[PDB]
Amino acid sequence: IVGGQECKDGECPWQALLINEENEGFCGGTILSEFYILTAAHCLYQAKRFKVRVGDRNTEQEEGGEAVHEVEVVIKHNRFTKETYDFDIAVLRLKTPITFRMNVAPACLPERDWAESTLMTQKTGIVSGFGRTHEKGRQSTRLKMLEVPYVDRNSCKLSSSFIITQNMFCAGYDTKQEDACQGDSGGPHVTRFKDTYFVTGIVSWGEGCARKGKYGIYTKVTAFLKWIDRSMKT
Amino acid sequence: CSLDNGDCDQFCVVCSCARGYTLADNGKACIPTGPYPCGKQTLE
Numbered sequence: 001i002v003g004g005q006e007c008k009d010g011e012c013p014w015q016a017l018l019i020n021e022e023n024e025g026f027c028g029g030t031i032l033s034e035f036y037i038l039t040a041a042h043c044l045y046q047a048k049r050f051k052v053r054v055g056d057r058n059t060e061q062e063e064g065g066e067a068v069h070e071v072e073v074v075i076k077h078n079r080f081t082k083e084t085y086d087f088d089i090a091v092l093r094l095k096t097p098i099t100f101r102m103n104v105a106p107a108c109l110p111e112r113d114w115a116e117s118t119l120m121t122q123k124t125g126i127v128s129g130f131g132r133t134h135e136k137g138r139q140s141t142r143l144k145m146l147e148v149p150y151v152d153r154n155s156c157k158l159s160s161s162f163i164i165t166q167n168m169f170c171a172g173y174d175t176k177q178e179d180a181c182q183g184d185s186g187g188p189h190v191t192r193f194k195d196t197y198f199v200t201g202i203v204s205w206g207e208g209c210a211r212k213g214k215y216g217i218y219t220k221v222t223a224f225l226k227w228i229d230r231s232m233k234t
Numbered sequence: 235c236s237l238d239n240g241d242c243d244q245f246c247v248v249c250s251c252a253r254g255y256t257l258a259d260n261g262k263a264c265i266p267t268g269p270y271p272c273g274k275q276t277l278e
C-alpha cells in the first residue's frame with residue numbers, strides 16, 4: 001500500500017497473506033469462509049509452492065492469532081491470461097478450516113444485482129495488504145489499509161495503456177500518492193454498506209504504483225459471484 | 235428498492251441477508267448468528 005495507514009487491531013480481519021517457500025509474503029487474499037480464500041489468478045504463477053497465513057498484522061513479529069494453512073485445491077479461472085489480465089480471479093480451498101477469531105473473519109459476498117446497483121455505486125471502497133509502500137520500494141512489514149474512490153470506467157479507460165474489461169473496475173486517485181501496489185495483488189477490496197463489509201474487488205494491477213494519471217485496477221467480483229459459488233461447492 | 239435500499243440493512247420491498255445472518259423480526263435488520271459473522275470488523 002502506498003499512502004494509507006496501518007490497519008488497527010481487528011479492522012482488516014479478512015486479510016490473508018500468501019507466503020512462498022522463502023516464508024515471504026508475495027500476494028494477498030480475502031477470507032471468504034473457513035475453507036476458502038479469494039485471490040488473483042496471476043498470483044498463482046509467482047510461486048510454485050505457497051501457503052496461506054491468516055491473522056497476521058506484522059510480518060516481523062509472531063503475535064497471537066497467526067496461523068498457517070496448506071492449500072488443498074487451487075481453482076484458477078480458466079480464462080485468465082497474462083496477455084489481458086482479464087478474469088484475474090482464483091479460489092483456494094484450504095486443507096484445514098480457519099478458526100475465526102480476532103483479526104480472522106470472512107468478508108461477505110453480495111448478491112449480484114444488488115451489489116452492481118447499490119455497492120458499486122458507493123463513493124469509496126477499502127483496499128488492504130502487505131505490499132510495497134512505494135512503487136520501486138520494499139514490501140510493508142505491517143498490514144496497511146487504504147480508502148479508494150471508485151473511478152468512472154470511461155475516465156479509467158482513457159488513462160490506461162491496456163484494455164479495461166467488464167471484468168475489471170478502477171479505483172484510487174488521479175494524482176494523489178495513494179494506491180495499492182505490488183504485493184497487495186490478490187488482496188481484498190471491500191465496500192462498506194451501513195455496518196457490513198462486502199468483498200467487491202480483488203487487487204489486480206496498475207501501471208506503476210500511485211502514478212499520476214493512472215488508477216488501480218481491480219477484478220470486479222460481481223462478475224464472478226456465480227463462478228465463486230460454483231468454485232466453493234467444489 | 236430505489237430509495238433508501240428499501241430501508242434494508244443488507245440486501246433489498248423484500249429485505250434479506252448474507253450467510254451467517256438471519257433477517258430480524260422487523261423484517262429489515264440482519265442478525266448475526268455466530269460470534270464472527272462475515273463482514274464485521276472484530277472486537278476483543
Ligand SMILES: COc1ccc(NC(=O)[C@H]2CN(S(C)(=O)=O)C[C@@H]2C(=O)Nc2ccc(-n3ccccc3=O)cc2F)cc1F
Nearest residue numbers: 083084085135162180181182185203204205206208216217
Ligand atoms: C490496484 O492494485 C494494484 C495497483 C498497482 C499495482 N502496480 C503494480 O503492480 C506494478 C508495480 N511494479 S514495479 C514497477 O513496482 O515493478 C510492476 C507492476 C506492474 O507493472 N503491473 C502490471 C501492469 C500491467 C498489467 N497488464 C494489464 C493488462 C494487460 C496486460 C498487463 O500486463 C499487469 C501488471 F501486473 C499493482 C496492484 F495490484
Ligand SMILES: [Ca+2]
Nearest residue numbers: 058061062063
Ligand atoms: Ca506477525
Ligand code: NA
Nearest residue numbers: 173174211214
Ligand atoms: Na494515480
